[PDB]
Paper text:
Mutations in BLM and WRN are associated with the rare genetic diseases Bloom and Werner syndromes, respectively. BLM acts preferentially on recombination and repair intermediates containing HJs to promote efficient branch migration.
Crystals were obtained in conditions that included either a phosphate ion or an arsenate ion. The two crystals, which belong to the same space group, were employed for X-ray data collection. The structures of human BLM RQC complexed with a phosphate ion and an arsenate ion were determined at resolutions of 2.7 and 2.9 Å, respectively. The asymmetric unit of each crystal contains two RQC monomers (Mol-A and -B), which are bridged to each other by the ion (P1 or As1) shared at the interface. These structures demonstrate that P1 and As1 play a key role in lattice formation. For the arsenate ion complex, the X-ray data were also collected at the peak wavelength of arsenate (1.0439 Å) to calculate the anomalous difference Fourier map.
Author numbering: 1074 to 1194
Write the structure that this text describes.
């Protein structure tokens, strides 16, 4: 039903912004520790107040039910727009964190439109 292209474009723009300090000579890289879990991305999006970041896309998710906002990211991974790798921390825990998939650049070029099915329950 509902077309979510502009939202995904911004989610993608956003995820990539928090990957480096783009600009100054040393384009130094973030993560794995500074990368987001899907859940932290949901929280941020749904302008939660446990959100790690509270700028960029913080407001944007306010018309989505948590359940849906979830399903949207699940989709964005599936669709290879966003992807997720594992990180192992010092206490030997495996944490799945998000990053762009080979499809992210596509959506940023108007070339893919993203549509979403709003689910109840």
């Amino acid at each position: 039903t509902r077309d979510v292209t502009d939202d995904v474009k911004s989610i993608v723009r956003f995820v990539q912004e928090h990957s480096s300090s783009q600009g100054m000579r040393n384009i130094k890289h973030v993560g794995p520790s500074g990368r987001f879990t899907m859940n932290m991305l949901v929280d941020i999006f749904l302008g939660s107040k446990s959100a790690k970041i509270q700028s960029g896309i913080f407001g944007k998710g306010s018309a989505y039910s948590r359940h849906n906002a979830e399903r949207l990211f699940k989709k964005l991974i599936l669709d290879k727009i966003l992807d997720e790798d594992l990180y192992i921390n010092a206490n030997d825990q495996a944490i799945a964190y998000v990053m762009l998939g080979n499809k992210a650049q596509t959506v940023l070029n108007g070339n893919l439109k993203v549509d979403f099915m709003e689910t109840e329950n």
